[PDB]
Amino acid sequence: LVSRFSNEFGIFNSLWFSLGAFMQQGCDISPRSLSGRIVGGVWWFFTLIIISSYTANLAAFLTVERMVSPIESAEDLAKQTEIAYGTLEAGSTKEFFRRSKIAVFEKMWTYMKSAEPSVFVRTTEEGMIR
Amino acid sequence: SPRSLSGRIVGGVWWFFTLIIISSYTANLAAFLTVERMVSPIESAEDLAKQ
Amino acid sequence: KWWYDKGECGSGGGDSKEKTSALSLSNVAGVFYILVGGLGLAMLVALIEFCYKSR
Amino acid sequence: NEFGIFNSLWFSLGAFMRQGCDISPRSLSGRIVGGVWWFFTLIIISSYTANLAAFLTVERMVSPIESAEDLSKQTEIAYGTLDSGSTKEFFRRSKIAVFDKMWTYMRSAEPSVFVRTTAEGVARVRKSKGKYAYLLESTMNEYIEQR
Amino acid sequence: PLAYEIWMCIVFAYIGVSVVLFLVSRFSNEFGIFNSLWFSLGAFMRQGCDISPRSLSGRIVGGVWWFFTLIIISSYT
Amino acid sequence: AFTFAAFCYMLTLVLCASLIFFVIWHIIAFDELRTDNIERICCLLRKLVVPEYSIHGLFCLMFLCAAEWVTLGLNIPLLFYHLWRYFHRDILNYCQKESWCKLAFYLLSFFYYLYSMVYTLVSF
Amino acid sequence: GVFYILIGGLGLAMLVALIEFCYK
Amino acid sequence: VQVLLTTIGAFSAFGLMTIAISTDYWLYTRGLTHSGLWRICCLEGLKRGVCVKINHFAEYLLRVVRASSIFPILSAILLLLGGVCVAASRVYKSKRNIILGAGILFVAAGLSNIIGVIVYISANAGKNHYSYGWSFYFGGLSFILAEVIGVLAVNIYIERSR
Ligand SMILES: O=c1[nH]c2cc(C(F)(F)F)c(N3CCOCC3)cc2n(CP(=O)(O)O)c1=O
Ligand SMILES: Oc1nc2ccc(-c3c(Cl)cccc3OC(F)(F)F)cc2[nH]1
Ligand SMILES: CCCCCCCCCCCCCC
Ligand SMILES: CCCCCCCCCCCCCC
Ligand SMILES: CCCCCCCCCCCCCC
Ligand SMILES: CCCCCCCCCCCC
Ligand SMILES: CCCCCCCCCCCC
Ligand SMILES: CCCCCCCCCCCC
Ligand SMILES: CCCCCCCCCCCC
Ligand SMILES: CCCCCCCCCC
Ligand SMILES: CCCCCCCC
Ligand SMILES: CCCCCCCC
Ligand SMILES: CCCCCCCC
Ligand SMILES: CCCCCCC
Ligand SMILES: CCCCCCC
């Protein structure tokens, strides 16, 4: 609408030029007037911000995905509180944890002693399917 | 732009070189700022015992 | 034992730092507002230039 | 080569946004400026992208306050204490200037910053995001923090 | 940063896009088998293209390939 | 899944369709000469035959790097016929039979890429 | 996804070229 | 041909945008309560049928715009102002300049229509899976048809001058 007040900027060339400007690849044509150049510069700023933000977000996603650590040791399971760990309801494991005078196991015992969900299962198969 | 064939080969190889260099420079600079921002000073005795 | 050991929250579990949220329009609208404002300003200056050229 | 005050602006804008420039400078003293501006915009865009990638990767949220002598100067967060107790009596008869200013602010404060029970105090703390602060004992503070 | 299976897919997609653009510009701007390789190479390396396709069926290949090299380079960085 | 051979079979469907139009335009040029300016009918035929032989050269090259040698065997005899024409460079009845087989061969192999590609994508 | 978009764009361009060639 | 495709489009874009802002079936959140523009009518909220008005109370400038939805309405005000400008082709004809005045309003409403969604999405979010209802997609047609009517109204002005 701007570049056709009464050039080569029709309705088919405008879409092509704007698509080339969004992809940061450029075209052979360019706005000759002033307001057309303003539109082009604003669109260039917008697409530059968009592309930079997308690249930054993708890099952050990949870096966060690569910086992961699975729970391996008991010390990692005691510190990590997102996964709730439980044992048999009445077995040798509960009796061992109740009499374990180790700082690594004491915190785990106090965590498993007070918990809203079920942290003790009667049958081992029920715990397996859980 | 190069009009001949071998002239276009020079531009094509140079374009591949500057693309890898710029991409590696941007990727490395992002790693520098990220590692610098992900720092933790020693505050507690537990942090001093581990470090 | 009675204050820090019997705690309800852990520093290790809370500091997950995984699965960052995807970027939404909640913080990108600042550039769309500027884009629309620039389009409006360009249309206005084009109309003003046309009115000046007609006179 | 024209390169007027308008065409030069257009070329510089096309060079800053990594877009394809319409024309290139013919003279050497213009090509120097063109190359220098190209290097400048390349460095700037690379640094901007690197910093934006470093932002979304790791987050470092800092507390809006660090001590009592700092919040007494900003006066942007309305802090409250107990109605009648050790804290109120201590802030009442205070010879130091900082706690005296804190007390004379808490006295003429609308609405009333004083709270009857500590439960309502911690409830108001949890409700208000960044506009409230409670002044209690360090032991009870640590206990509430660990709950 | 990119697996070896992607590098083999980029080269054949680069030539594949180039040969299609030559076929599109044949049924009807020269865009021969040589100029199409140069335009696609200048578009993949984020450089300024010499010429742009005139027909609509040629502009589709240019815009699509532009989105391809933008995603690939952004993912590589 | 997603293999390099699966992507090679996808580019063939877009490229083999263009080879179909060449052999179809060939029988139209031979039909016009059979009914009957003569230079434009043969010079254009020389311009269309070159891309048809060069595009098929990629079909024998893409599958070579894709380790799909079971499909390469279905395209090697087609490339061997191009060597005879390239070496030597009535005739109407002979060339007519030499072009109808192209339309049938470029179509039966076209359905292979339409099915062999599915045999790898959904088979994840 | 970008490879699918590329293939779809190539197919659509071939179809548009066919339509524009048959238009004359 | 194109002289008639604009008047029918103005009444098919204004009469279609006023419906998208009238019925409150834009967003579907979770009980499952469908949302709207000025008020949301709850469903499965411990009551059979309940529909209450939302209460929204330098970020205060965005809340008043979301409450007082002027941008999704200003686009409908410009669609009727441009719909009567093209209606002036019969009465007071041979002007060759009033058609250009309609091409500006037909596109100025599209700029105020895309804005009315940016202020609506940024305030919506400011887990819970939410979708967009059929009533929200109607407003999208009020922008696509606002550009086709903005290219068909200016093209006539160019042909009249040439
Ligand atoms: O002497 C004992 N021999 C045990 C032998 C087994 C196993 F062989 F592995 F089956 C197990 N299980 C391991 C995990 O829980 C399910 C069964 C527990 C045993 N217990 C503890 P209880 O079953 O609670 O008495 C003993 O005291
Ligand atoms: O009054 C209104 N104008 C509108 C313009 C566009 C859309 C829209 C569509 Cl049509 C499809 C998908 C997302 C959309 O909105 C977005 F913001 F992009 F998420 C909705 C509109 N409503
Ligand atoms: C292409 C030129 C774009 C210019 C954009 C200017 C944006 C100014 C925003 C100012 C924000 C101030 C916040 C305190
Ligand atoms: C502009 C075109 C550049 C092409 C570069 C090709 C490099 C090939 C390197 C192969 C390395 C193989 C390692 C196993
Ligand atoms: C998708 C391919 C469509 C092909 C349509 C061909 C139509 C041919 C009409 C004229 C036939 C003349 C035969 C002598
Ligand atoms: C004729 C111009 C030669 C290049 C001068 C500028 C190059 C970019 C900046 C280099 C700084 C070391
Ligand atoms: C005429 C061409 C219009 C644009 C088509 C390609 C756009 C880039 C890819 C978009 C995929 C959703
Ligand atoms: C808000 C009070 C009036 C509601 C009118 C609803 C009309 C619905 C029409 C649906 C057409 C598909
Ligand atoms: C709270 C009152 C809401 C009233 C909404 C009226 C909408 C009128 C739209 C008119 C468009 C031409
Ligand atoms: C749906 C037809 C138009 C309804 C609104 C009429 C004007 C109301 C002004 C308050
Ligand atoms: C060559 C013309 C220069 C005009 C400068 C105008 C500055 C506002
Ligand atoms: C228009 C000329 C095409 C030449 C193709 C050559 C392929 C090696
Ligand atoms: C003369 C026809 C113009 C069509 C423009 C369509 C824009 C989406
Ligand atoms: C409605 C305007 C159509 C212009 C076509 C230019 C190729
Ligand atoms: C030849 C096709 C022209 C389409 C113009 C509107 C996109």
PDB file of N, CA and C in Angstrom, chain A residues 28-88:
ATOM      1  N   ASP A  28      17.257  -8.571  -4.614  1.00  0.00           N
ATOM      2  CA  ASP A  28      17.823  -7.589  -5.531  1.00  0.00           C
ATOM      3  C   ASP A  28      17.073  -6.263  -5.487  1.00  0.00           C
ATOM      4  N   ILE A  29      15.805  -6.283  -5.087  1.00  0.00           N
ATOM      5  CA  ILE A  29      15.004  -5.070  -5.017  1.00  0.00           C
ATOM      6  C   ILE A  29      15.100  -4.486  -3.613  1.00  0.00           C
ATOM      7  N   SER A  30      14.803  -3.192  -3.502  1.00  0.00           N
ATOM      8  CA  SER A  30      14.857  -2.491  -2.228  1.00  0.00           C
ATOM      9  C   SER A  30      13.907  -1.307  -2.293  1.00  0.00           C
ATOM     10  N   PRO A  31      13.306  -0.916  -1.170  1.00  0.00           N
ATOM     11  CA  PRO A  31      12.373   0.220  -1.188  1.00  0.00           C
ATOM     12  C   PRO A  31      13.075   1.510  -1.589  1.00  0.00           C
ATOM     13  N   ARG A  32      12.484   2.214  -2.553  1.00  0.00           N
ATOM     14  CA  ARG A  32      13.055   3.457  -3.054  1.00  0.00           C
ATOM     15  C   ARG A  32      12.576   4.680  -2.286  1.00  0.00           C
ATOM     16  N   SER A  33      11.357   4.648  -1.752  1.00  0.00           N
ATOM     17  CA  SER A  33      10.800   5.786  -1.035  1.00  0.00           C
ATOM     18  C   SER A  33      11.351   5.821   0.390  1.00  0.00           C
ATOM     19  N   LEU A  34      10.795   6.703   1.222  1.00  0.00           N
ATOM     20  CA  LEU A  34      11.235   6.860   2.603  1.00  0.00           C
ATOM     21  C   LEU A  34      10.448   5.967   3.558  1.00  0.00           C
ATOM     22  N   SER A  35       9.118   6.018   3.485  1.00  0.00           N
ATOM     23  CA  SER A  35       8.293   5.190   4.359  1.00  0.00           C
ATOM     24  C   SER A  35       8.482   3.706   4.063  1.00  0.00           C
ATOM     25  N   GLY A  36       8.702   3.356   2.794  1.00  0.00           N
ATOM     26  CA  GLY A  36       9.031   1.978   2.470  1.00  0.00           C
ATOM     27  C   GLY A  36      10.337   1.537   3.102  1.00  0.00           C
ATOM     28  N   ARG A  37      11.334   2.424   3.112  1.00  0.00           N
ATOM     29  CA  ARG A  37      12.596   2.109   3.774  1.00  0.00           C
ATOM     30  C   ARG A  37      12.409   1.985   5.282  1.00  0.00           C
ATOM     31  N   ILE A  38      11.515   2.792   5.858  1.00  0.00           N
ATOM     32  CA  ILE A  38      11.215   2.675   7.284  1.00  0.00           C
ATOM     33  C   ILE A  38      10.595   1.314   7.583  1.00  0.00           C
ATOM     34  N   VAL A  39       9.630   0.901   6.755  1.00  0.00           N
ATOM     35  CA  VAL A  39       9.013  -0.415   6.916  1.00  0.00           C
ATOM     36  C   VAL A  39      10.067  -1.510   6.811  1.00  0.00           C
ATOM     37  N   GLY A  40      10.947  -1.401   5.813  1.00  0.00           N
ATOM     38  CA  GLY A  40      11.992  -2.398   5.646  1.00  0.00           C
ATOM     39  C   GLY A  40      12.926  -2.474   6.837  1.00  0.00           C
ATOM     40  N   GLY A  41      13.324  -1.320   7.373  1.00  0.00           N
ATOM     41  CA  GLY A  41      14.212  -1.317   8.525  1.00  0.00           C
ATOM     42  C   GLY A  41      13.559  -1.876   9.772  1.00  0.00           C
ATOM     43  N   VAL A  42      12.284  -1.541   9.996  1.00  0.00           N
ATOM     44  CA  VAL A  42      11.578  -2.081  11.153  1.00  0.00           C
ATOM     45  C   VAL A  42      11.427  -3.593  11.029  1.00  0.00           C
ATOM     46  N   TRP A  43      11.093  -4.078   9.829  1.00  0.00           N
ATOM     47  CA  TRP A  43      10.986  -5.520   9.624  1.00  0.00           C
ATOM     48  C   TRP A  43      12.337  -6.204   9.799  1.00  0.00           C
ATOM     49  N   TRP A  44      13.415  -5.547   9.362  1.00  0.00           N
ATOM     50  CA  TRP A  44      14.753  -6.101   9.544  1.00  0.00           C
ATOM     51  C   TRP A  44      15.097  -6.221  11.021  1.00  0.00           C
ATOM     52  N   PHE A  45      14.815  -5.170  11.796  1.00  0.00           N
ATOM     53  CA  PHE A  45      15.046  -5.227  13.236  1.00  0.00           C
ATOM     54  C   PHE A  45      14.238  -6.349  13.876  1.00  0.00           C
ATOM     55  N   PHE A  46      12.964  -6.472  13.493  1.00  0.00           N
ATOM     56  CA  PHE A  46      12.109  -7.508  14.064  1.00  0.00           C
ATOM     57  C   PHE A  46      12.650  -8.901  13.762  1.00  0.00           C
ATOM     58  N   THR A  47      12.983  -9.167  12.494  1.00  0.00           N
ATOM     59  CA  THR A  47      13.450 -10.502  12.134  1.00  0.00           C
ATOM     60  C   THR A  47      14.825 -10.795  12.722  1.00  0.00           C
ATOM     61  N   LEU A  48      15.680  -9.777  12.867  1.00  0.00           N
ATOM     62  CA  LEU A  48      16.972  -9.989  13.510  1.00  0.00           C
ATOM     63  C   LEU A  48      16.792 -10.369  14.972  1.00  0.00           C
ATOM     64  N   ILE A  49      15.936  -9.633  15.688  1.00  0.00           N
ATOM     65  CA  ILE A  49      15.654  -9.968  17.080  1.00  0.00           C
ATOM     66  C   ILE A  49      15.084 -11.377  17.184  1.00  0.00           C
ATOM     67  N   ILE A  50      14.164 -11.729  16.281  1.00  0.00           N
ATOM     68  CA  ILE A  50      13.520 -13.039  16.337  1.00  0.00           C
ATOM     69  C   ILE A  50      14.540 -14.150  16.111  1.00  0.00           C
ATOM     70  N   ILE A  51      15.388 -13.997  15.091  1.00  0.00           N
ATOM     71  CA  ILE A  51      16.361 -15.038  14.773  1.00  0.00           C
ATOM     72  C   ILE A  51      17.389 -15.175  15.889  1.00  0.00           C
ATOM     73  N   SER A  52      17.870 -14.049  16.424  1.00  0.00           N
ATOM     74  CA  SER A  52      18.835 -14.113  17.516  1.00  0.00           C
ATOM     75  C   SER A  52      18.231 -14.780  18.746  1.00  0.00           C
ATOM     76  N   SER A  53      16.986 -14.430  19.081  1.00  0.00           N
ATOM     77  CA  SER A  53      16.335 -15.034  20.238  1.00  0.00           C
ATOM     78  C   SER A  53      16.109 -16.525  20.029  1.00  0.00           C
ATOM     79  N   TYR A  54      15.733 -16.927  18.812  1.00  0.00           N
ATOM     80  CA  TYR A  54      15.519 -18.344  18.534  1.00  0.00           C
ATOM     81  C   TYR A  54      16.820 -19.126  18.652  1.00  0.00           C
ATOM     82  N   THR A  55      17.907 -18.588  18.093  1.00  0.00           N
ATOM     83  CA  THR A  55      19.200 -19.258  18.192  1.00  0.00           C
ATOM     84  C   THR A  55      19.645 -19.370  19.645  1.00  0.00           C
ATOM     85  N   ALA A  56      19.477 -18.288  20.414  1.00  0.00           N
ATOM     86  CA  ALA A  56      19.862 -18.310  21.820  1.00  0.00           C
ATOM     87  C   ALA A  56      19.044 -19.327  22.605  1.00  0.00           C
ATOM     88  N   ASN A  57      17.734 -19.384  22.355  1.00  0.00           N
ATOM     89  CA  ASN A  57      16.884 -20.322  23.078  1.00  0.00           C
ATOM     90  C   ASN A  57      17.212 -21.762  22.708  1.00  0.00           C
ATOM     91  N   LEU A  58      17.512 -22.023  21.433  1.00  0.00           N
ATOM     92  CA  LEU A  58      17.895 -23.373  21.034  1.00  0.00           C
ATOM     93  C   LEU A  58      19.219 -23.779  21.673  1.00  0.00           C
ATOM     94  N   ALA A  59      20.186 -22.857  21.714  1.00  0.00           N
ATOM     95  CA  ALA A  59      21.453 -23.147  22.374  1.00  0.00           C
ATOM     96  C   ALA A  59      21.249 -23.431  23.856  1.00  0.00           C
ATOM     97  N   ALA A  60      20.388 -22.650  24.515  1.00  0.00           N
ATOM     98  CA  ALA A  60      20.115 -22.873  25.930  1.00  0.00           C
ATOM     99  C   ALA A  60      19.438 -24.220  26.153  1.00  0.00           C
ATOM    100  N   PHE A  61      18.478 -24.567  25.291  1.00  0.00           N
ATOM    101  CA  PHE A  61      17.817 -25.864  25.384  1.00  0.00           C
ATOM    102  C   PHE A  61      18.824 -27.000  25.261  1.00  0.00           C
ATOM    103  N   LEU A  62      19.697 -26.928  24.253  1.00  0.00           N
ATOM    104  CA  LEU A  62      20.672 -27.994  24.046  1.00  0.00           C
ATOM    105  C   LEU A  62      21.662 -28.078  25.203  1.00  0.00           C
ATOM    106  N   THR A  63      22.081 -26.929  25.741  1.00  0.00           N
ATOM    107  CA  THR A  63      23.022 -26.942  26.856  1.00  0.00           C
ATOM    108  C   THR A  63      22.383 -27.517  28.113  1.00  0.00           C
ATOM    109  N   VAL A  64      21.123 -27.165  28.381  1.00  0.00           N
ATOM    110  CA  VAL A  64      20.434 -27.709  29.548  1.00  0.00           C
ATOM    111  C   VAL A  64      20.205 -29.207  29.382  1.00  0.00           C
ATOM    112  N   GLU A  65      19.902 -29.652  28.160  1.00  0.00           N
ATOM    113  CA  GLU A  65      19.705 -31.078  27.928  1.00  0.00           C
ATOM    114  C   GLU A  65      21.008 -31.849  28.097  1.00  0.00           C
ATOM    115  N   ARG A  66      22.126 -31.278  27.641  1.00  0.00           N
ATOM    116  CA  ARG A  66      23.410 -31.960  27.771  1.00  0.00           C
ATOM    117  C   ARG A  66      23.926 -31.960  29.203  1.00  0.00           C
ATOM    118  N   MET A  67      23.525 -30.989  30.017  1.00  0.00           N
ATOM    119  CA  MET A  67      23.967 -30.907  31.409  1.00  0.00           C
ATOM    120  C   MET A  67      22.940 -31.560  32.335  1.00  0.00           C
ATOM    121  N   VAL A  68      22.872 -32.886  32.254  1.00  0.00           N
ATOM    122  CA  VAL A  68      21.966 -33.679  33.074  1.00  0.00           C
ATOM    123  C   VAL A  68      22.776 -34.747  33.796  1.00  0.00           C
ATOM    124  N   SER A  69      22.286 -35.152  34.967  1.00  0.00           N
ATOM    125  CA  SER A  69      22.966 -36.159  35.770  1.00  0.00           C
ATOM    126  C   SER A  69      21.956 -37.127  36.375  1.00  0.00           C
ATOM    127  N   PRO A  70      21.964 -38.391  35.961  1.00  0.00           N
ATOM    128  CA  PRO A  70      21.031 -39.359  36.544  1.00  0.00           C
ATOM    129  C   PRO A  70      21.434 -39.741  37.959  1.00  0.00           C
ATOM    130  N   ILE A  71      20.435 -40.130  38.749  1.00  0.00           N
ATOM    131  CA  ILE A  71      20.677 -40.533  40.131  1.00  0.00           C
ATOM    132  C   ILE A  71      21.380 -41.884  40.135  1.00  0.00           C
ATOM    133  N   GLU A  72      22.595 -41.917  40.681  1.00  0.00           N
ATOM    134  CA  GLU A  72      23.392 -43.136  40.724  1.00  0.00           C
ATOM    135  C   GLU A  72      23.677 -43.604  42.142  1.00  0.00           C
ATOM    136  N   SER A  73      24.206 -42.733  42.996  1.00  0.00           N
ATOM    137  CA  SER A  73      24.566 -43.116  44.352  1.00  0.00           C
ATOM    138  C   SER A  73      23.441 -42.781  45.329  1.00  0.00           C
ATOM    139  N   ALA A  74      23.575 -43.300  46.552  1.00  0.00           N
ATOM    140  CA  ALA A  74      22.591 -43.011  47.589  1.00  0.00           C
ATOM    141  C   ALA A  74      22.669 -41.562  48.049  1.00  0.00           C
ATOM    142  N   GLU A  75      23.863 -40.964  48.008  1.00  0.00           N
ATOM    143  CA  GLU A  75      23.995 -39.556  48.376  1.00  0.00           C
ATOM    144  C   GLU A  75      23.260 -38.659  47.389  1.00  0.00           C
ATOM    145  N   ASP A  76      23.247 -39.038  46.109  1.00  0.00           N
ATOM    146  CA  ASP A  76      22.503 -38.265  45.120  1.00  0.00           C
ATOM    147  C   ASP A  76      21.001 -38.434  45.307  1.00  0.00           C
ATOM    148  N   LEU A  77      20.566 -39.626  45.724  1.00  0.00           N
ATOM    149  CA  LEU A  77      19.143 -39.853  45.953  1.00  0.00           C
ATOM    150  C   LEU A  77      18.658 -39.156  47.217  1.00  0.00           C
ATOM    151  N   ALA A  78      19.526 -39.021  48.221  1.00  0.00           N
ATOM    152  CA  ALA A  78      19.130 -38.338  49.450  1.00  0.00           C
ATOM    153  C   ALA A  78      18.988 -36.838  49.227  1.00  0.00           C
ATOM    154  N   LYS A  79      19.877 -36.248  48.424  1.00  0.00           N
ATOM    155  CA  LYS A  79      19.800 -34.816  48.158  1.00  0.00           C
ATOM    156  C   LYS A  79      18.645 -34.494  47.217  1.00  0.00           C
ATOM    157  N   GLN A  80      18.442 -35.324  46.198  1.00  0.00           N
ATOM    158  CA  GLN A  80      17.362 -35.105  45.244  1.00  0.00           C
ATOM    159  C   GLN A  80      16.024 -35.447  45.888  1.00  0.00           C
ATOM    160  N   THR A  81      15.110 -34.477  45.912  1.00  0.00           N
ATOM    161  CA  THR A  81      13.802 -34.647  46.529  1.00  0.00           C
ATOM    162  C   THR A  81      12.673 -34.770  45.516  1.00  0.00           C
ATOM    163  N   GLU A  82      12.979 -34.745  44.216  1.00  0.00           N
ATOM    164  CA  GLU A  82      11.924 -34.854  43.213  1.00  0.00           C
ATOM    165  C   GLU A  82      11.393 -36.276  43.108  1.00  0.00           C
ATOM    166  N   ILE A  83      12.235 -37.274  43.362  1.00  0.00           N
ATOM    167  CA  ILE A  83      11.842 -38.677  43.313  1.00  0.00           C
ATOM    168  C   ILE A  83      11.710 -39.195  44.738  1.00  0.00           C
ATOM    169  N   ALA A  84      10.538 -39.738  45.064  1.00  0.00           N
ATOM    170  CA  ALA A  84      10.286 -40.302  46.381  1.00  0.00           C
ATOM    171  C   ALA A  84      10.652 -41.780  46.384  1.00  0.00           C
ATOM    172  N   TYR A  85      11.536 -42.167  47.299  1.00  0.00           N
ATOM    173  CA  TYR A  85      12.025 -43.534  47.397  1.00  0.00           C
ATOM    174  C   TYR A  85      11.404 -44.214  48.608  1.00  0.00           C
ATOM    175  N   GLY A  86      10.902 -45.437  48.406  1.00  0.00           N
ATOM    176  CA  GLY A  86      10.291 -46.196  49.473  1.00  0.00           C
ATOM    177  C   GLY A  86      10.761 -47.639  49.459  1.00  0.00           C
ATOM    178  N   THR A  87      10.435 -48.347  50.540  1.00  0.00           N
ATOM    179  CA  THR A  87      10.822 -49.745  50.681  1.00  0.00           C
ATOM    180  C   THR A  87       9.624 -50.606  51.062  1.00  0.00           C
ATOM    181  N   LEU A  88       9.882 -51.862  51.420  1.00  0.00           N
ATOM    182  CA  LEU A  88       8.818 -52.758  51.846  1.00  0.00           C
ATOM    183  C   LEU A  88       8.189 -52.261  53.144  1.00  0.00           C
TER     184      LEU A  88
END
